[PDB]
Amino acid sequence: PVNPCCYYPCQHQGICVRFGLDRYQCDCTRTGYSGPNCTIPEIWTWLRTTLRPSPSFIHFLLTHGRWLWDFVNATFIRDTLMRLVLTVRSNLIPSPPTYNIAHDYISWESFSNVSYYTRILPSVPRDCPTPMGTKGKKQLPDAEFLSRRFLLRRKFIPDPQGTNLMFAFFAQHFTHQFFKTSGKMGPGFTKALGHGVDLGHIYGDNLERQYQLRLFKDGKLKYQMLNGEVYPPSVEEAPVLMHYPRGIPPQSQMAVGQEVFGLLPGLMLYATIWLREHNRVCDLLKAEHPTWGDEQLFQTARLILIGETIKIVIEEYVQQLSGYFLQLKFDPELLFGAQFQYRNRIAMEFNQLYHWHPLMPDSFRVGPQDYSYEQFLFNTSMLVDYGVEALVDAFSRQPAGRIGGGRNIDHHILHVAVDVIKESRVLRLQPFNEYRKRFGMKPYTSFQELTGEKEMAAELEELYGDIDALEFYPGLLLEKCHPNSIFGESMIEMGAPFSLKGLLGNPICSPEYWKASTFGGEVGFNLVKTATLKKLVCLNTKTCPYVSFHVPD
Amino acid sequence: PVNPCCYYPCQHQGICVRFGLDRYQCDCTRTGYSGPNCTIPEIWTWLRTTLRPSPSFIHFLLTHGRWLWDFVNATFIRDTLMRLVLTVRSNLIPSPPTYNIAHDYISWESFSNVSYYTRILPSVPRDCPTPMGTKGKKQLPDAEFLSRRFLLRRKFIPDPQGTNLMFAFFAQHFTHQFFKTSGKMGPGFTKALGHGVDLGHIYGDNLERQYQLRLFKDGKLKYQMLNGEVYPPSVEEAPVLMHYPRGIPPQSQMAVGQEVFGLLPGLMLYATIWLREHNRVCDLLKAEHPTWGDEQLFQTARLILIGETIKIVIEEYVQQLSGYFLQLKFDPELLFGAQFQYRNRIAMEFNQLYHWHPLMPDSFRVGPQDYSYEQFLFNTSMLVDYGVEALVDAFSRQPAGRIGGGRNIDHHILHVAVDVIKESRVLRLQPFNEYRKRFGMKPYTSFQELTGEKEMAAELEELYGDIDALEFYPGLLLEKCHPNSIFGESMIEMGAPFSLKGLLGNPICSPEYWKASTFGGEVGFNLVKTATLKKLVCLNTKTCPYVSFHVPD
Numbered sequence A, B: 001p002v003n004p005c006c007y008y009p010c011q012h013q014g015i016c017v018r019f020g021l022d023r024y025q026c027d028c029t030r031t032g033y034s035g036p037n038c039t040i041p042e043i044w045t046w047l048r049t050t051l052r053p054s055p056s057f058i059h060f061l062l063t064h065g066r067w068l069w070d071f072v073n074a075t076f077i078r079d080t081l082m083r084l085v086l087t088v089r090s091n092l093i094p095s096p097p098t099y100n101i102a103h104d105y106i107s108w109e110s111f112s113n114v115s116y117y118t119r120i121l122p123s124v125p126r127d128c129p130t131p132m133g134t135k136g137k138k139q140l141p142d143a144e145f146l147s148r149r150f151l152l153r154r155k156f157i158p159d160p161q162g163t164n165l166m167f168a169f170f171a172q173h174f175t176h177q178f179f180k181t182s183g184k185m186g187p188g189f190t191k192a193l194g195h196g197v198d199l200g201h202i203y204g205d206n207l208e209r210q211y212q213l214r215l216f217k218d219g220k221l222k223y224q225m226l227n228g229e230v231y232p233p234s235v236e237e238a239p240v241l242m243h244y245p246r247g248i249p250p251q252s253q254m255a256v257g258q259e260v261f262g263l264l265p266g267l268m269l270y271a272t273i274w275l276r277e278h279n280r281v282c283d284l285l286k287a288e289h290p291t292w293g294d295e296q297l298f299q300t301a302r303l304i305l306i307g308e309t310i311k312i313v314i315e316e317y318v319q320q321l322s323g324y325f326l327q328l329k330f331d332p333e334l335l336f337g338a339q340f341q342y343r344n345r346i347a348m349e350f351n352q353l354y355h356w357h358p359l360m361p362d363s364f365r366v367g368p369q370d371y372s373y374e375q376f377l378f379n380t381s382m383l384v385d386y387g388v389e390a391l392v393d394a395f396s397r398q399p400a401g402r403i404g405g406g407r408n409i410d411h412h413i414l415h416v417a418v419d420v421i422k423e424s425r426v427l428r429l430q431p432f433n434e435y436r437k438r439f440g441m442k443p444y445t446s447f448q449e450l451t452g453e454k455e456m457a458a459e460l461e462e463l464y465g466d467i468d469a470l471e472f473y474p475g476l477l478l479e480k481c482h483p484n485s486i487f488g489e490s491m492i493e494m495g496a497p498f499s500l501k502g503l504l505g506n507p508i509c510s511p512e513y514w515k516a517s518t519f520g521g522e523v524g525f526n527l528v529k530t531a532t533l534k535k536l537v538c539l540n541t542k543t544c545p546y547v548s549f550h551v552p553d
């Protein structure tokens, strides 16, 4: 017969389990629901559900009435909510992890083979009628067409919140620590073990590689001097696998710890920023700690930057993204009261949802100059010709695409979005609406309801046949935005839990790690605590330019 | 000058940090103490310390007055204490981990390179005057002599608590999951990634190896039929690295997942027991779940046995070891209230303290027959000639050495204890008395106080010069026992936290994992919950013999 699990009968996180020839059962353990499918609510659950406001409403409360928020921020309520935000959001993510591409059930292998992404919902069983469960047509909308029609940039739609390329690239740099999908093993698998903010894009994803980059004196990273300015070394001084155009592969060529940053100037830019940071830090340690070995100076500088990364990410990055009036606060001691696992494992759906290409503009403006994609991609010289100050200034001033809402990827990078849909189909990712459910939301009942506009709605409806069969990635980028947001409801609510668990699940946030000692004393500790995009830039430059995650005025 | 940290100035878990040319500072963050060395107690700490009874006293309460305990066990207090036991004990161990052989300071590498054991206290800095801090002679007592004199069995001292070889071997089997010290990388390093009860001694420490053992039908492990009895397959049917005497390396040769079990008959015995278990379980799954793949049947059987292992370990193993009247209880839901990290990382000191060779007897009695060490070690045929029932019966009936108290390793295996002291010295393990401190105890002020007997006391005293300089491993095995115990104060108090954190830090204990679903439903779940040494034996045999962790009457 039909695999019963193809109907996704078990609700509210209950686990579908096949029995006998053709039966199923749900595991409602700890779901707050009981009954055949986990839909009869417990005493308290039912109180919560009635008294739960909508994601939209909360969003509104947070984006409105600064008078109340200026007061809140000023008091401890800032910490009370920050804690709330941290615990309720985190909690929706399995820790320790659950599944992967091979196992649609907890297993020792899935727990211990750190080479996999995890997954939050299982796969569509291989044996289902329609390719995504029980509804839709047999064939699914042709990837290519789907993007052409709904994701291809018509005219440039700027992000309504003032988000800049200075942000965009940081977004890319940063994420590419833990998105390193494997060429050799294939989709579902990751080179970026560590699965978090390990800075394995500065330090390399392996010790052999990291060892090529280390200067081994005073625990510094290797570098080179071009125009009296510090930059990463060449592969001539640091042999190590870097994907680059063969052509000028010695000098001009650079090595960084993420084998892909050689490509776009904005990547190498941040790589330069952080390297200058690493060494600047060491300088301040060796000051304090003459007796310290090179190894210690290295490992400790690392920890500083890891901490520094997470502060900026939370208090600058996510602050800007969210457009909140609640002033976000990075402070691990907030979670010492709570029950939190200090471990992280990158999920595939996360991989899928962080494909923020729409941010990317039509061209790249550097003061008077205006560079084509053709001119910008692979530009081996652009970083060193312009100088970090002038490039930071540049990106800080140029806008970026409203991520969600649709029709907003520039045609150059459109094929990436196509491949994402292609692998989505390879990974057997469940229907969008099923993910809506798992992240607490109500599933959509129409395409018109998904994106509040008839044209795309009816056209999608015709293509997919059914809203339930609407795929995950399309779902995310086509959904209507809240008023004046970078993206819509489903992006926030599925994005948050992954992001926060990534950030706070880091061991350095742990009670065990989060001490002055661990960052070599107060100067270390306060470097983390007083971290700032503007500091990470200007402390490492001769000049201090415009540096921000939003365009001026 | 002298590295200030060689005095171990920072108390109560405060972290010594070198500053400038010759200064130090303590990191008393969250120690419950403040002041220069972390010795000025906080308001509550001071209340706890006054109101803390001695380890000895508690031990007495637990081993005495069954009338009170028969009542306690019968009520919920059994769970209240079991929880207490679990939380207070666990807590003394860093999670996430701290150091390793390379780093005497938290680092990303030490956090993420799972190839190391961790360590609870740092090393003796390389630059200290005496080889163990500031006291003792320059040279340390000659390993060989130290064992000859104090650890070599005179006459056999049986364990006063009735502990048998049936226990002894389980102890060895079990532990050798997570003690797999690496030949190639050297001391400080481990083949046994997983760092816990992963059953990587049944399933192998790698997927390539595990794949050689799997039958790949109905998710069973490969096997062979000798005398109508099931046993592990030969290397002819399962090629895979097994350390064995070259000689009869085809048939007669066996493969198991731990490359060392080929040696002693009691190891292969348990290997046989668990393999029979694995397949017996699969049989019961395939019954329920016809549609299930081979992969699922395999991963799930695993989880059952992992759970089954931990129940028996806690409720039978540690029960017997402890001689408690409080009836220990394996129940993960006990910790869902608490703040617990569901991760484990095997420490070196743990490695060091679990060298329970003294358990091993003078010879091996199998009913009428009496086998020399010469006859027992490497006996390729002994398992299959005798039959598991008759061998279980045998070990269940023969005693075992009082582990602590001294002078109790049989001369055959004495060199192991020598090597342990040798690597202790390689790993730069801190003084015994420093470990006493870190595990809450008061340091010893005399050798006479360590083992309450003048002869060994004054002789040690002369050899080591100072109690502070007394090494870790000697300390553990020479210390006086509580009345009628298998070992003394320091073994329990340093052993417990590691053991419980190993057991309960397992992901399957997690809220996220601990569901009927995860073990494929109620039959799975109850297999874990109703687990028993006696079941693990008799359900897999034609006959049911004497099977117990203690000798009869």
Ligand code: HEM
Pocket: A168, A169, A171, A172, A173, A175, A176, A179, A180, A181, A182, A264, A351, A354, A355, A356, A357, A359, A360, A413, A416, A419, A420
């Ligand atoms: C001009 C700038 C950019 C270019 C040229 C670009 C291009 C690409 C390419 C070629 C791929 C790989 C396609 C594949 O493997 O199928 C990719 C994937 C990806 N992109 Fe972009 N992208 C840009 C900006 C961004 C931004 C702003 C983000 C948002 C943080 C981002 C995040 C990602 C991620 C996370 C992946 C998948 C990585 C993995 O699975 O390992 N990229 N992009």
Ligand code: HEM
Pocket: B168, B169, B171, B172, B173, B175, B176, B179, B180, B181, B182, B264, B351, B354, B355, B356, B357, B359, B360, B413, B416, B419, B420
């Ligand atoms: C006749 C039985 C036994 C023999 C012949 C034996 C012998 C040995 C040998 C040869 C070593 C390795 C020496 C070295 O690498 O320096 C060793 C280490 C060890 N033994 Fe025993 N032993 C026996 C029983 C036990 C028992 C009852 C236990 C207690 C659980 C035990 C636990 C260990 C452990 C945990 C190690 C270190 C493993 C590692 O670092 O990987 N053994 N023993």
Ligand SMILES: *[C@@H]1O[C@H](CO)[C@@H](O[C@@H]2O[C@H](CO)[C@@H](O[C@@H]3O[C@H](CO)[C@@H](O)[C@H](O)[C@@H]3O)[C@H](O)[C@H]2NC(C)=O)[C@H](O)[C@H]1NC(C)=O
Pocket: A206, A207, A208, A211, B113, B115, B184, B185
């Ligand atoms: C966990 O850490 C250990 C030890 O740090 C890593 O193993 C070791 O890796 C290094 C570099 O890969 C090897 O060092 C040697 O140094 C010279 C310096 O020029 C190098 O050129 C030589 O080729 C040589 O390999 C070392 O041999 C190797 N072995 C050990 C145990 O020291 C291990 O790779 C780490 N584990 C993981 C998975 O990262």
Ligand SMILES: *[C@@H]1O[C@H](CO)[C@@H](O[C@@H]2O[C@H](CO)[C@@H](O[C@@H]3O[C@H](CO)[C@@H](O)[C@H](O)[C@@H]3O)[C@H](O)[C@H]2NC(C)=O)[C@H](O)[C@H]1NC(C)=O
Pocket: A113, A115, A184, A185, B206, B207, B208, B211
């Ligand atoms: C994590 O899991 C992956 C996938 O299970 C492991 O990689 C894969 O390992 C297997 C066995 O080592 C390879 O399978 C192939 O199967 C045939 C069957 O006879 C075997 O004889 C061939 O030699 C062949 O290798 C497979 O190639 C390999 N690659 C992948 C990604 O599938 C990986 O080893 C695991 N990671 C760790 C560290 O355990």
Ligand SMILES: CC[C@@H](CO)NC(=O)Cc1c(C)n(C(=O)c2ccc(Cl)cc2)c2ccc(OC)cc12
Pocket: A063, A082, A085, A086, A089, A314, A318, A319, A321, A322, A323, A324, A328, A329, A482, A484, A485, A486, A487, A488, A489, A491, A492, A494, A495, A496, A497, A499, A500
């Ligand atoms: C909808 C458009 C605007 C609102 O005007 N942006 C957001 O809501 C972005 C956002 C918030 C608020 N996240 C938090 O849940 C969050 C924000 C701040 C703190 Cl402190 C904690 C969580 C995210 C977590 C992850 C994420 O990427 C995947 C985006 C977000």
Ligand SMILES: CC[C@@H](CO)NC(=O)Cc1c(C)n(C(=O)c2ccc(Cl)cc2)c2ccc(OC)cc12
Pocket: B063, B082, B085, B086, B089, B314, B318, B319, B321, B322, B323, B324, B328, B329, B482, B484, B485, B486, B487, B488, B489, B491, B492, B494, B495, B496, B497, B499, B500
């Ligand atoms: C001193 C001799 C007798 C007492 O007569 N044995 C013990 O005390 C052994 C013992 C107890 C009690 N452990 C618990 O702390 C323990 C026991 C039971 C539960 Cl449920 C939890 C912890 C150990 C944890 C680990 C361990 O090996 C390293 C031994 C032990």
Ligand SMILES: *[C@@H]1O[C@H](CO)[C@@H](O[C@@H]2O[C@H](CO)[C@@H](O)[C@H](O)[C@H]2NC(C)=O)[C@H](O)[C@H]1NC(C)=O
Pocket: A007, A008, A009, A036, A037
């Ligand atoms: C739980 O869900 C299952 C499957 O989704 C339900 O079975 C369906 O019953 C509904 C209404 O009673 C019908 O629409 C279908 O005929 C059934 N579908 C399938 C696939 O079997 C089941 O009724 C639910 N459990 C209960 C008892 O409410």
Ligand SMILES: *[C@@H]1O[C@H](CO)[C@@H](O[C@@H]2O[C@H](CO)[C@@H](O)[C@H](O)[C@H]2NC(C)=O)[C@H](O)[C@H]1NC(C)=O
Pocket: A369, A374, A375, A376, A377, A378, A379, A380, A381, A382, A385
């Ligand atoms: C990559 O960028 C570099 C430097 O940014 C380009 O060289 C400059 O281009 C501008 C206008 O495009 C001109 O003024 C000059 O030809 C160059 N700079 C000056 C003032 O000398 C280069 O052409 C680009 N290469 C690629 C890959 O397109």
Ligand SMILES: *[C@@H]1O[C@H](CO)[C@@H](O[C@@H]2O[C@H](CO)[C@@H](O)[C@H](O)[C@H]2NC(C)=O)[C@H](O)[C@H]1NC(C)=O
Pocket: B007, B008, B009, B036, B037
């Ligand atoms: C903390 O410990 C250090 C070092 O162990 C103390 O320094 C010692 O002071 C004691 C008594 O005052 C003397 O025995 C030694 O002369 C000192 N030893 C060393 C190695 O310096 C220090 O006094 C303690 N901190 C305080 C202020 O109580």
Ligand SMILES: *[C@@H]1O[C@H](CO)[C@@H](O[C@@H]2O[C@H](CO)[C@@H](O)[C@H](O)[C@H]2NC(C)=O)[C@H](O)[C@H]1NC(C)=O
Pocket: B369, B374, B375, B376, B377, B378, B379, B380, B381, B382, B385
């Ligand atoms: C290993 O053990 C086997 C079987 O347990 C030994 O063979 C038996 O030894 C007993 C007495 O030692 C004798 O009755 C026989 O010689 C054997 N069994 C019978 C009844 O046939 C064997 O000698 C041992 N080998 C080693 C490694 O010493």
